[PDB]
């Protein structure tokens, strides 16, 4: 790895600089280097890893959606323009799949197996579900069903731990439930499951807000608002 010669602490420091500079590809490379040092990640470091790759894959997903829409229009009275749209959509798709495979590979070697505390294990299992979900967004062939089940299985394991080990207002638990509800609505063709999960999650968090400090209340209610926004879109 090109980061093998850099100190762990220097990689973390540079990841934070890259974030400030909006250099998310660099940020992701630095955080991959940090993970590959083999030590477990702290809370802050897990969040840097997630921010970096979410921004990288987010740009790829946005580009893929633009190109897929153009390709779909071309296949409706539409003039034949050759293979270029498909080729370039495939190029972006392959790069997106490569990033997802990179993240999944870090989780499998060896972040998840070393994560014993609920906060870390739930975080990584949620990430596994998320990156399989991004793979499912672009999957078509004989792999779509297995990719969807991999996302579902990771989210479900994370949900089971989070319900046993975390309060209903915990921001990781809330973000997991939010993303699993999105999985149900957008990937698994299960809008009723999505709505039910978002509603129950929101209501159980509401009933636990009284236990929180002002700062924790702000953290939790920010994510609850996303659940409510989806419920407004879905109903």
């Amino acid at each position: 790895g090109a980061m093998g010669s850099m100190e762990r602490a220097s990689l973390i420091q540079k990841a934070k600089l890259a974030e400030q500079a909006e250099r998310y590809e660099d940020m992701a490379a630095f955080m991959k280097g940090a993970v590959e040092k083999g030590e477990e990640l702290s809370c802050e470091e897990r969040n840097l890893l997630s921010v970096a790759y979410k921004n990288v894959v987010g740009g790829q997903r946005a580009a893929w959606r633009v190109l897929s829409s153009i390709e779909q229009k071309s296949n409706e009275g539409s003039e034949e323009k050759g293979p270029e749209v498909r080729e370039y959509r495939e190029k972006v798709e392959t790069e997106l799949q490569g990033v997802c495979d990179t993240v999944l590979g870090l989780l499998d070697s060896h972040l998840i197996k070393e994560a014993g505390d609920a906060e870390s294990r739930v975080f990584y299992l949620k990430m596994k579900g998320d990156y399989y979900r991004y793979l499912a967004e672009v999957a078509t062939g004989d792999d779509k069903k297995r990719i969807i089940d991999s996302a579902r299985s990771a989210y479900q394991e994370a949900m089971d731990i989070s319900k046993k080990e975390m309060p209903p207002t915990n921001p990781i638990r809330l973000g997991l439930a939010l993303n699993f509800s999105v999985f149900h609505y957008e990937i698994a063709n299960s809008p009723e499951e999505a709505i039910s999960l978002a509603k129950t999650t929101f209501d159980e968090a509401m009933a636990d807000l009284h236990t929180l400090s002002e700062d924790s209340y702000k953290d939790s209610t920010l994510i609850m608002q996303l659940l409510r926004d989806n419920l407004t879109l879905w109903t």
């Binding site: 997630s50 939010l178 509800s181 609505y185 957008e186 920010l222 994510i223 989806n230 879109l233």
Partner: peptide
């Protein structure tokens, strides 16, 4: 309109 997922 696409659904909102977790923010960073």
């Amino acid at each position: 309109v696409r659904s909102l997922s977790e923010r960073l």
